[PDB]
Amino acid sequence: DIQMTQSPSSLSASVGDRVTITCRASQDVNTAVAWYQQKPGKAPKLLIYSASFLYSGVPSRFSGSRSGTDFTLTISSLQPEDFATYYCQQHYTTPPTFGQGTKVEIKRTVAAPSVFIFPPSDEQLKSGTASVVCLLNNFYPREAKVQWKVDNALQSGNSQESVTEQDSKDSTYSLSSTLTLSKAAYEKHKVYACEVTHQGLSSPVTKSFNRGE
């Protein structure tokens, strides 16, 4: 019945920056608050217990504090390995409740994507479907616009995107866009192009191929 309102939902900071995440309990929870870190694909990890105590093995850059119903997690010097989602939790009453989470990404300089386009393989075509893949490699920031053009006509509803988690070594993202067509529709057109707009590019970059050539 006790809610934990966590803010912000996401934040970006550079290596070495001081990061602040806050959590407001809907009523008094004394010091029965914990903070957790969760990295992609891993179980949550305890950082702070009893509002302000650093848990065993946790780097000293993490700290917690309390003021009334307001709880604060601080990272004094943000590191690249700190890319994760952070969660507050109260256990003053049952059920224990979690905050909604704060996604923390590492800020870095703008980097333009390297763009690649892949036609469907001849093996896939024999199966009856055609997938066209556009790759945006190692870019920052995450926001990017990728449009498909088939015979110079803009496509809608036939592509899906996927984005990697931030790279641990250079803090970039990579992105795939996949255009799916029937084999019959694929063979009815010539020019397949993916046009990429990104902050790191002076003007949109287009990679294309002509079917069969």
Binding site: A32, A34, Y36, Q38, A43, P44, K45, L46, Y49, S50, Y55, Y87, Q89, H91, T94, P95, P96, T97, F98, G99, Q100, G101, S114, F116, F118, P119, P120, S121, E123, Q124, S127, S131, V133, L135, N137, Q160, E161, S162, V163, T164, S174, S176, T178, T180
Partner: protein, 212 residues
């Protein structure tokens, strides 16, 4: 050291039953509360249930009350989550944890999690197609169910520059992903590039050579 190890997850039909186990090492579960906490795909953490194994007292989240039963066997140092009347909304990674120091240390140890997928869809192994070619190359791992799949390159010898994308759910209800890698253009045509795809739920293993 303290360990919590889950088992028992997998793919189950809606309306079905499944029992998870949480095996504790390095401490006695008689001393603590044991919890189950779950995480739906792309969502946050949700507490499910707790038990105090010494007297078997239990508490449940309203979302699972009556349908799920948490239990424990102190002589096996193991706790259990019996799930019944399973619904698609129950699809999640299920974690077990403990209250450390009677709660003072909060949830200080967690298991690795076990994925529970509630769906009427049948298992299906992936089709693997080459993404033929600094140059980029890759493999398209298409039309599989359920999660997860793993991808390596050259049996683990190629790791730098690899990006294996998170799977997307297609309109057909099947998953699809690509794994790519950037390599020196000078290596094409002589150096062999093989993607190693494993889909344990369907017992499918594919090694696909990617040729220019």
């Amino acid at each position: 050291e303290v360990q919590l190890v889950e088992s028992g997850g997998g793919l189950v039909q809606p309306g079905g039953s499944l029992r998870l186990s949480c095996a504790a090492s390095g401490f006695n579960i008689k001393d603590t509360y044991i919890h189950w906490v779950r995480q739906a795909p792309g969502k946050g953490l949700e507490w499910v249930a707790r038990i105090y194994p010494t007297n078997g007292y239990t508490r449940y989240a309203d979302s699972v009350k009556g349908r799920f039963t948490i239990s424990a066997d102190t002589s096996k140092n193991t706790a259990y989550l019996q799930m019944n009347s399973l619904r698609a909304e129950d699809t999640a990674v299920y974690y077990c944890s403990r209250w450390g120091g009677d709660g003072f240390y909060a949830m200080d140890y967690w298991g690795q999690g076990t994925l529970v997928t509630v769906s009427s869809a049948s298992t299906k192994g992936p089709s693997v197609f080459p993404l033929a070619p600094t140059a980029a190359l890759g493999c398209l791992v298409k039309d599989y169910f359920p999660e997860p799949v793993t991808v390596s390159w050259n049996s683990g010898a190629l790791t730098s520059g690899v990006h294996t994308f998170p799977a997307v759910l297609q309109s057909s209800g099947l998953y699809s992903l690509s794994s790519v890698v950037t390599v020196p253009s000078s290596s094409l045509g002589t150096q062999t590039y093989i993607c190693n795809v494993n889909h344990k739920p369907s017992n499918t293993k594919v090694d696909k050579k990617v040729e220019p």
